[PDB]
Amino acid sequence: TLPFTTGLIYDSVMLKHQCSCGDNSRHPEHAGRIQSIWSRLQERGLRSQCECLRGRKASLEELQSVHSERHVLLYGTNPLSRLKLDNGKLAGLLAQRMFVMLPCGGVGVDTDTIWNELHSSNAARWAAGSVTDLAFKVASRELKNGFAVVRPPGHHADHSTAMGFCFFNSVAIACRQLQQQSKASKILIVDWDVHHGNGTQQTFYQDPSVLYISLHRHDDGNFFPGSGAVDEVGAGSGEGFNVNVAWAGGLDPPMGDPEYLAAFRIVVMPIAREFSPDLVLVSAGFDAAEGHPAPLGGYHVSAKCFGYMTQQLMNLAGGAVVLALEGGHDLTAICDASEACVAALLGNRVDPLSEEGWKQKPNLNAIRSLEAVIRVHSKYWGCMQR
Numbered sequence: 001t002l003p004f005t006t007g008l009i010y011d012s013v014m015l016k017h018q019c020s021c022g023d024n025s026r027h028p029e030h031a032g033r034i035q036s037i038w039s040r041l042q043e044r045g046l047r048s049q050c051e052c053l054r055g056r057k058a059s060l061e062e063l064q065s066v067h068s069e070r071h072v073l074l075y076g077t078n079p080l081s082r083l084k085l086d087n088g089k090l091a092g093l094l095a096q097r098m099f100v101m102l103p104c105g106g107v108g109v110d111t112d113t114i115w116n117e118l119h120s121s122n123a124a125r126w127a128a129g130s131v132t133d134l135a136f137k138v139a140s141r142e143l144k145n146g147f148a149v150v151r152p153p154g155h156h157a158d159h160s161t162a163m164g165f166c167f168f169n170s171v172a173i174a175c176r177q178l179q180q181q182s183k184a185s186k187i188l189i190v191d192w193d194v195h196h197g198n199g200t201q202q203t204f205y206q207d208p209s210v211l212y213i214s215l216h217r218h219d220d221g222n223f224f225p226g227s228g229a230v231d232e233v234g235a236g237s238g239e240g241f242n243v244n245v246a247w248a249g250g251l252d253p254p255m256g257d258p259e260y261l262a263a264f265r266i267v268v269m270p271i272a273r274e275f276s277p278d279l280v281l282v283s284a285g286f287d288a289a290e291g292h293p294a295p296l297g298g299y300h301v302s303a304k305c306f307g308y309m310t311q312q313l314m315n316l317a318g319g320a321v322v323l324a325l326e327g328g329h330d331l332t333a334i335c336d337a338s339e340a341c342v343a344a345l346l347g348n349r350v351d352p353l354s355e356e357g358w359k360q361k362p363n364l365n366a367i368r369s370l371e372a373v374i375r376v377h378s379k380y381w382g383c384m385q386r
């Protein structure tokens with residue numbers, strides 16, 4: 001009801017992260033992703049309804065709440081910064097007579113993960129500080145929820161590893177920052193990008209204060225990045241607080257709405273309520289959308305299903321919900337998916353009766369995959385027991 005209680009995060013800083021080969025056809029994590037989304041938000045009348053924010057750069061201190069000092073200095077600084085770094089640090093960055101040459105002749109961290117020598121450090125720090133900033137507002141309660149239209153994505157970047165199009169784990173940084181500023185708070189991270197958020201899982205693996213729930217294509221270790229099997233529940237104090245909805249059995253039958261709606265009904269929502277989070281962050285990749293062919297997906301989740309998933313998560317944590325863009329590169333599918341999530345965020349309700357496709361039962365691979373989730377997590381969660 002209260003107006004402008006929903007924020008949107010976007011800035012053109014983030015468009016500059018582009019290979020120097022100048023060819024979007026070999027580089028699916030391109031600037032077009034976030035720009036094509038931004039305008040969809042206007043043409044449909046949603047931007048006006050939101051507290052729009054530009055974001056800011058994360059400080060090196062914020063980055064270090066998740067990443068090593070060497071990763072941070074590598075990807076968070078520029079030669080030559082107005083930066084006051086001590087000479088030993090300066091010397092360390094000289095030992096890396098490093099870089100990787102891409103087949104296209106541009107610089108990369110690996111074949112897929114490109115580096116612009118002028119602009120990528122600024123764009124990565126900007127994605128991370130924007131999600132941190134959109135989130136702080138929601139935590140203060142100065143906003144109800146919000147949506148971060150950020151790139152590059154974050155959820156594959158681990159403590160000292162950039163990979164998978166990601167350099168800093170924007171969501172994990174926001175999580176840590178939030179927790180610094182509100183003692184004893186409990187944070188739920190829901191990751192619905194089709195790939196396992198290996199960096200997020202690892203950041204929080206031994207930490208009972210954060211519950212991580214990933215839904216991802218897994219298929220017995222044979223989908224990028226190979227990580228995030230169902231038996232990975234957390235370790236030490238954090239045992240039970242890592243939930244991998246690891247989908248097995250491949251692309252046949254089709255994996256789409258009935259499976260995702262079932263995963264929410266049976267696993268995400270009940271465990272989430274039992275955890276009872278102070279705030280919910282979503283790694284909201286749209287690469288499980290209809291529109292991604294075999295290699296980068298194969299799934300058929302729809303805009304409305306993403307909308308309805310957003311809408312259910314709003315029942316949690318007093319409504320404190322922040323989505324951050326992760327993966328997904330088919331432009332119409334990511335734009336449809338974002339719009340749906342954004343309507344949903346404003347207080348629009350989706351009608352589950354409206355879709356005939358949602359009368360279909362989840363396929364058996366899905367059921368099986370969930371049975372394994374259940375069987376594993378019955379040890380830790382009451383709603384999973386018996």
Ligand SMILES: [K+]
Pocket residue numbers: 191192193194195196197214215216
């Ligand atoms: K995921």
Ligand SMILES: [K+]
Pocket residue numbers: 204205206207208209210211212234238241242
């Ligand atoms: K955890």
Ligand SMILES: [Zn+2]
Pocket residue numbers: 019020021022023026027102104105106114
């Ligand atoms: Zn290139």
Ligand SMILES: [Zn+2]
Pocket residue numbers: 193194195285287326327328
């Ligand atoms: Zn992905």
